[PDB]
Amino acid sequence: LTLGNTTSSVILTNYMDTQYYGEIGIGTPPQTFKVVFDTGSSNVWVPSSKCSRLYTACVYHKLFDASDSSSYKHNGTELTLRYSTGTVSGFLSQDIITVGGITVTQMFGEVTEMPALPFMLAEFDGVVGMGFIEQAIGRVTPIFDNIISQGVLKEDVFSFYYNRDSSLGGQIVLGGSDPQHYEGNFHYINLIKTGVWQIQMKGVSVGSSTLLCEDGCLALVDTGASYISGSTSSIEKLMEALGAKKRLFDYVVKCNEGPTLPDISFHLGGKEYTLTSADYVFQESYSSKKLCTLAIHAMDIPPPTGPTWALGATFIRKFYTEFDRRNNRIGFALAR
């Protein structure tokens, strides 16, 4: 592990409080793409120009064209990323990727098959996994690992900051953290094991009456997830306590009832991380004649990683998050 002095930052744009993306450039000359940085995965991919135009999502996004890059390096082995909410498929390619000022040769997948649902709903073009190589599909070295191999980063860590206003939309600091966006001290929790940004969660409290995860649970700290999620079983009890009713994909409460929802706390490493209704309710109205969505979904992640809760933007918006790769821990601090 070689440590330099360079720390870099990627300015993120906030889309509806659900999607936080930044720009990266691939090839020579650079072909820019909008991508989300997902600690819940380890691969990098952008839509390919070789993607059949019958995939409308490809018609509605920036396509990487290898024929215009002089740095491109062919490989072609097939690749399929099966995410929780959808799947993408294509092949592996190599070229120079610029991110936050750093130029690194990277193996990424050129997606040639990306379904309308959910990708048509995607503001971003691709994804940059910030997970360990252990979670990488196709055994492809993660872009951060490669950057660390350059020995330019001052620290073997990166931090995320998600702003509330959908000003700066968000900010990722590679090689450290930005004290401008957090106050108080960082409080760390150790990873259940290296290879996954998952930590032990001692318990989830809702208001004063209910207590979920009383025997412990797993908490994946997911920068690529918009909401906070728990096993269907957990969310049912949780939502029961909130008085919310379940629709096809999310939960909602009559907007007038929104402001009076109880607090929800997540016990992590001996520190109570609390959210208020304003933290998880999309309060777009106060009338009883309208339904307000909750930023908490139900999602059952399969073993070996699941069952587990997922702490996404809903959580990260309030708590500045630092991902420490050298000490295999995650640190939280109050965002500002």
Ligand X SMILES: *[C@@H]1O[C@H](CO)[C@@H](O)[C@H](O)[C@H]1NC(C)=O
Residues in contact with ligand VYF, counted by CB under 6 A, come to a total of 23
> Of 175, 224, 230, 258, which lies in the binding site for ligand VYF, with binding defined by CB under 6 A?
224
Residues 63-82 that bind ligand X (CB under 6 A): 75-77
Discontinuities in the chain (C→N > 2.5 Å), after residue: 166
For the question of residue 222 being annotated catalytic, the response is: yes
CA-to-CA distance for 129 and 134, rounded, in angstroms? 12
Nearer to ligand VYF, 200 or 285 (CB): 200
* 188: exposed, middle or buried (Cβ count in 10 Å: 0-12, 13-18, 19+): middle
Does residue 334 contact residue 266 with C-beta atoms inside 8 Å?
no
Closest CA to 133 of 107, 110, 111: 107
Residue 149 binds ligand X (CB under 6 A): no
For residues 127 to 156, the per-residue mask of contacts with ligand VYF, x marking binding by CB under 6 A and - elsewhere, is x-------x-x-------------------
CA-to-CA distance for 249 and 160, rounded, in angstroms? 27
Residue nearest to ligand VYF (CB): 40
| Token pair 């957990």: residue | 234
Contacts of 169 (CB under 8 A, 6+ apart): 11, 12, 13, 14, 15, 20, 163
CA-to-CA distance for 327 and 25, rounded, in angstroms? 30
For residues 64 to 103, the per-residue mask of contacts with ligand VYF, x marking binding by CB under 6 A and - elsewhere, is -----------------xxxxxx-----------------
Nearer to ligand X, 136 or 217 (CB): 136
CB of 46 to ligand X, least distance (A): 18
Residues in contact with ligand X, counted by CB under 6 A, come to a total of 3
**Catalytic residue positions?**
38, 222
Give the residues lining the site for ligand VYF (CB under 6 A).
19, 36, 38, 40-41, 81-86, 118-119, 121-122, 127, 135, 137, 222, 224-225, 301, 305
